[PDB]
Nucleic acid binder design. Structure first.
Lengths: 451, 446
RNA sequence: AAA
RNA sequence: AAA
């Protein structure tokens, strides 16, 4: 009966935060990193999230210490209702019901005073934002909801700085999910400009705008914001993360490594940094290949070794880091370690990424591996088709269609009356939009089928 | 040397008239019918054609009689004489009387030179262009495109010429009849028919054609006005009865149409067009009864008249088809098969007709012979003639029905899957067409 | 956080 | 000249 009341409270226990079991350690580390290095006006939500994590670990006593710390720092506000809601849920799981009802009454009293329509569900913009920040911290499966929280606020107060920031970040990350789909549009460009305007001293938002400007070819304008963000000390380690990405994609790879190595001293468990660092060594590996033996060779194997070390570290800390697992498997091919590349690809082939489009790249690169390392056109076709089976138009999907086409044409030159090759070729022409030639080949193949 | 000059004369011997052997008896009759009952200003052409027909029969002496009869009524000077003189030249050449052939050659040369004609023997004038058009228009449908060209050639210099306006309108009307069942068929012969009536106000033959064409285009009321005008006047009676009867039959007044056909048959009993029209009347009354002694009686009468038409003109394709379809009504599946196989060996001048042959034979195989396989064979053969039409759309539907029936008994039949995909392709559903092709190609994995 |  |  008390449970029916607790379920109405707005807090981490009722926000249906999707948290995979394999992501708990990395989540905890990312929460702790944020407590130390992220500069924000309010730090109530982050400590409340830490408490919820502790609870999920079975350390309920430790959660109360993070809730009580969240309340002490609050002294230095309606957002307290989030803390009181977690208090109520905690005491409930611990059998201390009497104390739980006290915090239910605290929430009810405030709800009573603010003429709130609900007995326990406080309807205000601050708590909408707290829900948004929690979702935006617990993995990509929650970003659509997170954007909705912030968007809900901007429908009544379009210049609310906090929601404008959460909305911009969510939109930017969702754009990142679709960065390789055809006709993808920068929905997050204007929201980011608006967020920077309403948070002029926020560097975290400035670097995201820079990267989005770089995405749209306006690289020069983006670097202006990079320099502005690096100026203020606000959340500098996070500015180092995204500043490195900008400089790497700009071509100044050496500048990025320096920033990442600095950032790694502060957040040594950041899988994002480990991945970025690996991408840097991968970038330097392509630079030398342009011009290997001697000290030139010792450099590649050293960098390949480092890229593997950091990619291997990222997936160790976060086993759900799919694209890092993919970069790892691809790097083992650069090292000639087909044994380990096969091992990781088999891991990737059993995954179901949140961004399902990523599965195209998994099948595509494994297809190339089959085509070039294993010289097995049969298995290359299987995985080029599986990549194509995810209809969402993209760059990798076009590459899968072309690789399928070229490789199928090779079969027909050795055997022009191969039924399977004719039908696959007709299938290719269907994907290319030329329906007349597709019907032609399907019909030609269906004649050979009549035997 | 003499032959080279004869090949330059404009007459039936150099007009490349396509006359199938089996069409000679009917042509000879239709020519005699025309001489007797068609009222035209100049009857020189039809007698010259009659002469040419007799020459082809091996009766050269009888041909000269028709050329000399053609020269008389003309006098009752005309440039059309060159057609007769040209035929005379050709006749005497075949009969070894070369010296006489040269006499007529000189007569043609003498006229060509006096009229400042560019050629020595080929007279360029609209009168002979019309004569060529009339000859082509009388020797079957394979010549109609050339016929229209002759009259069109004259209308390019004299758009108000009444004679060429009539020939062009009749050729266009018949040519529109060839494409009457094709999709998006346009009535290109309507306005030429109105103009032909304007320039030939006392010509009922053209009036009834304008009526029938109005009936085709939903203007049946306006058409019946011209039908009554043609019947009032008694010019070309028996011919006005033919097309008036068709007009009333397609309206629903069958008894009125039978009255006119039985009158016209007394005058031109050998006309295959009448016997066919009579059969269509009995077929119409048959359908009326359906919606016993009379039914079996008329079926016997319709078969008798269709049988009479094909007997007199073996190349009368659609009459042969109405015959085969009528034997089915009579429960004589043996004669139907016999006549359908005759049709299956034909090659109609109007190739589109072969869709109806295969389509109706497909139905015969589906419903009477209880063989869907042959029905599919012939529905496909009707479809293979890509010209869009009513029958082709019905062949696609009939094929679709059968393939769907087969799939109910066996959903994993490769052939049925591939055919249904072929069907959806003809219907314009490329997406559903590719779907069933891919489904079939999977079963073809082994 | 690859692309 | 069926349609």
């Amino acid at each position: 009966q008390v449970k029916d009341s607790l379920e109405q409270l707005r807090c981490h226990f009722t926000w249906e935060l999707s948290i995979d079991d394999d992501e708990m350690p990395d989540l905890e580390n990312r929460v702790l990193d944020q407590i130390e290095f992220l500069d924000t006006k309010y730090s109530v939500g982050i400590h409340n999230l830490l408490a919820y994590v502790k609870h999920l670990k079975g350390q309920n006593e430790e959660a109360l210490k993070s809730l009580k710390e969240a309340e002490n720092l609050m002294q230095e506000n309606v957002r307290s209702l989030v803390t009181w809601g977690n208090f109520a849920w905690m005491y409930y799981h611990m059998g201390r019901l009497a104390e739980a009802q006290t915090y239910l009454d605290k929430v009810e009293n405030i709800c009573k005073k603010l003429s709130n329509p609900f007995r326990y569900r406080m309807e205000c913009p601050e708590i909408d934002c707290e829900e948004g920040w929690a979702l935006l911290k617990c993995g990509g499966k929650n970003y659509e909801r997170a954007k909705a929280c912030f968007e809900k606020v901007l429908e009544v107060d379009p210049e609310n700085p906090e929601s404008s920031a959460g909305y911009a970040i969510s939109a930017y990350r969702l754009d990142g999910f679709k960065l390789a789909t055809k006709n993808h549009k920068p929905f997050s460009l204007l929201p980011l400009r608006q967020a920077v305007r309403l948070n002029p001293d926020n560097g975290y938002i400035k670097v995201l705008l820079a990267l989005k400007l770089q995405d749209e070819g306006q690289e020069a304008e983006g670097e202006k914001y990079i320099e502005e963000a690096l100026a203020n000390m606000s959340s500098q380690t996070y500015v180092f993360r995204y500043a490195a990405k900008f400089y790497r994609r700009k071509g100044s790879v050496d500048k990025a490594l320096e920033l990442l190595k600095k950032a790694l001293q502060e957040t040594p468990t950041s899988v994002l940094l480990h991945h970025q660092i690996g991408l840097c060594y991968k970038a330097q590996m392509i630079q030398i290949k342009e011009a290997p033996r001697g000290q030139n060779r010792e450099k590649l194997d050293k960098m390949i070794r480092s890229a593997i070390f950091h990619f291997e570290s990222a997936v160790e800390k976060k086993p759900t880091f799919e694209v890092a697992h993919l970069d790892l498997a691809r790097m083992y091919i650069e090292a000639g370690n087909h044994r380990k590349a096969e091992e990781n690809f088999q891991k990737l082939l059993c995954m179901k990424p949140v961004v399902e489009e990523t599965m195209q790249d998994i099948h595509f690169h494994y297809g190339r591996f089959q085509e070039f390392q294993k010289k097995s056109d049969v298995n290359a076709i299987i995985h080029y088709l599986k990549a194509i089976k995810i209809e969402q138009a993209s760059l990798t999907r076009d590459k899968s269609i072309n690789s399928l086409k070229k490789l199928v044409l090779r079969k027909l030159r050795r055997k022009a009356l191969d039924l399977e090759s004719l039908s696959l070729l007709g299938f290719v022409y269907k994907l290319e939009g030329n329906m007349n030639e597709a019907l032609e080949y399907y019909e030609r193949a269906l004649r050979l089928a009549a035997d």
